[PDB]
């Protein structure tokens, strides 16, 4: 009985593979052979932020690309001002171990979570002028990996157990449960039009969820190890995934298969964060050798290197406007890089 | 304009006050000691917590030194992802049931993974081999469990240097030191980092485990300071 189900699943997997192979017509690397190369990218650090006194796991640029909130293991949530290097707020957290943060699109709330299996939201606009916990979101079993504000009222967060959830701050309880993964859901990235999102887990696969309907649509099993980072192409029809393979890969939803791979011979250590430039050409990728890289997303040729960090680069964010690039690391320094010519 | 200057100055005060708060918190953070209670299964984690929603905390201070006990119980079985979060702790108190399947083999396969992790290679480990009385009863009962789950046990003699047992069974002492040697040889196999292992024998129910933890933490701090000064 169960063997029949296994055979059926294998047959459907073979059908999917054959359909993908048939749909494969050309190669992005083959077709990009006539494009003008980007060339060397010079990126000198502009601001260095030294308020933190413990390693940094997550930072998130604000909606206006000026304020950035960063989280450290010392139980602090500092909201910086990138231009003037000032700190606008510092929030002491209940649990020292936090693995994520999120700055709301409206700029009102801030999220945070970690090994406490709880997501905590700190509204920054109060009459008393105090950053108090607006709401606590409990219901997850494992640790809380990533949380991303879908709006000022909803939030999608992915936990250690094979389950994501679409919450609701007004009432506090889950609205939709996104089950189907096999390992720890390490990363999560919403769409530019907040219509879909991808949850890259540790079973070396990524799914595509539609928030309103609440069921998976596609599965991309290109990788061969745990997926640590994920990020959509600014168009919204492609995404890049980082893994412990030391290789990023570029998928497309419509083609339902990979496009090209950014593997390099001299890279052995895994990838922590992956992000795109505003235009989608450059592909930043933080590595464990403590040296963020820049990749030509159309040619898999390294353009520049954002060297300068003592420890592993745990976070990597390109501003919503596209100007700066902030790279926090485990040495507790946030550096705001920029381009010049 | 004057408005921009006023806003910038107000931001300056705000930054100064926040930095003063951070400065005050820095002393507390650098003074306290963080310990991760990572025990395999039910080997005495609850009773060790008693003697000293996902994560649990106890803020106990001993000999004018503060401590944190991080009992990460309600997490998932898999440990390869959130255990990198604990590479900044001073010590990883490890608890082993030295009495379903081979629990000692699982304990060893967890200890050497902890030892050889490229991020935890700088973090020291403290071993508490629980259930000494249970092991004594099992050995004196003529039960062939360790003797046939570890073939190498037969060709083993009690180490001469350490034998503080007043009247305990020589075979029980041999089993205790065999398991200690197993863990210690795993620890000393690879010296790719700057971490050490302190294996104890948690048998007494008095307030002696806390004293042992404090002594080992002082040893770890002194070792890291001496290495930082290049004296060691």
């Amino acid at each position, epitope marked *: 009985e169960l063997d029949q189900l296994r055979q059926e699943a294998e047959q459907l997997k073979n059908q999917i593979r054959d359909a993908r192979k048939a749909c494969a017509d050309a190669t992005l690397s083959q077709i990009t052979n006539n494009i003008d190369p980007v060339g060397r990218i010079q990126m000198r650090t502009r601001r260095t932020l030294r308020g933190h006194l413990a390693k940094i796991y997550a930072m998130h640029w604000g909606t206006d690309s000026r304020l950035l909130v960063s989280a450290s293991q010392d139980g602090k949530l500092i909201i910086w001002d990138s231009y003037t290097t000032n700190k606008v707020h510092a929030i002491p957290l209940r649990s020292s171990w936090v693995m994520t943060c999120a700055y709301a699109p409206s700029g009102n709330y801030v999220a945070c979570g970690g090994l406490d299996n709880i997501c905590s939201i700190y509204n920054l606009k109060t009459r008393e002028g105090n950053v108090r916990v607006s709401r606590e979101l409990a219901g997850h079993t494992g640790y809380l990996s990533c949380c991303r504000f879908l709006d000022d009222n909803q939030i999608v967060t992915s936990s250690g157990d094979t389950t994501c959830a679409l919450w609701d701050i007004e009432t506090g309880q889950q609205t939709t449960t996104f089950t189907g993964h096999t*390992g720890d859901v390490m990363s999560l990235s919403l769409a530019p039009d907040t219509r879909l999102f991808v949850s890259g887990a540790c079973d070396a696969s990524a799914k595509l969820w539609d928030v309103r309907e609440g069921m998976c649509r596609q599965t991309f099993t290109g990788h061969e190890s745990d997926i640590n980072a994920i990020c959509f192409f600014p168009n919204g029809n492609a995404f890049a995934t980082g893994s412990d393979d030391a290789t990023c890969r570029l998928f497309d939803l419509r083609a339902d298969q990979e496009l090209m791979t950014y593997s390099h011979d001299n890279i052995i250590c895994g990838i922590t964060s992956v992000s795109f430039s505003k235009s989608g050409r450059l592909l930043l990728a933080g590595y464990d050798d403590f040296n963020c890289n820049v990749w030509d997303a159309l040619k898999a040729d390294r353009a520049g290197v954002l060297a300068g960090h003592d420890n592993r680069v745990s976070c990597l964010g390109v501003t919503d406007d596209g100007m700066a690039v902030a790279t926090g690391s485990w040495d507790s320094f946030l550096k705001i890089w920029n381009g010049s010519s | 304009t004057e408005d921009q200057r006023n806003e910038e100055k107000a931001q300056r005060e705000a930054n100064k006050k926040i930095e003063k708060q951070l400065q005050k918190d820095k002393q507390v953070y650098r003074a306290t000691h963080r310990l991760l209670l990572l025990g395999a299964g039910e080997s005495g984690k609850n009773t060790i917590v008693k003697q000293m929603s996902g994560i649990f905390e106890t803020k106990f201070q001993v000999d004018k030194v503060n401590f944190h006990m991080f009992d990460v119980g309600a997490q998932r079985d898999e440990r390869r992802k959130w255990i990198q979060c604990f590479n900044d702790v001073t010590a990883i108190i490890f608890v082993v049931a030295s009495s379903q399947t081979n629990r000692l083999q699982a304990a060893l396969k967890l200890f050497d993974s902890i030892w050889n992790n*490229k991020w935890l290679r700088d973090t020291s480990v403290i071993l508490f081999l629980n259930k000494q009385d249970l092991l004594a009863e099992k050995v004196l009962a003529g039960k062939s469990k360790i003797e046939d789950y570890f073939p190498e046990f037969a060709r083993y003699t009690t180490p001469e240097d350490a034998t503080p047992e007043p009247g305990e069974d020589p075979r029980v002492t041999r089993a205790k030191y065999f398991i200690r040697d197993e863990f210690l040889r795993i620890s000393t196999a690879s010296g790719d980092g700057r971490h050490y292992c302190y294996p104890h024998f948690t048998c007494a129910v008095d307030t002696e485990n806390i004293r042992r933890v404090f002594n080992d933490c002082r040893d770890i701090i002194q070792r890291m300071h001496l290495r930082q000064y290049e004296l060691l």
Partner: nanobody
Amino acid sequence: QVQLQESGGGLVQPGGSLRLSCAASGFTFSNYKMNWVRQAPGKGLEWVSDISQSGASISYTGSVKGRFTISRDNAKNTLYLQMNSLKPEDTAVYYCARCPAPFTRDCFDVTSTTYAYRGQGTQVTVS
């Protein structure tokens, strides 16, 4: 995608011999540490052996030392376990696991009930 599927298995008499082969076709076989895992019919998952990236560092779980031999063929993308002189206690459901990250000398989460990089069941019975 890793697609770990073993072979061999069946029923043998006590003191017999068996030959289990593991086939991997979804990753670079030579950059990963491959280790066998067995699960008793009633008990939990139990680590039994392993093999290093090149095939130099080999360890066993005790009570299998000298009776079980593990080997790998990087070119053929196959992993072997030559098991000899069986006992009625050796019957289990052997799984061909795989450490999660490459170029690393440790791997956690191999003896867990929800691990994603291990094969299906290969029933081995001794009567």
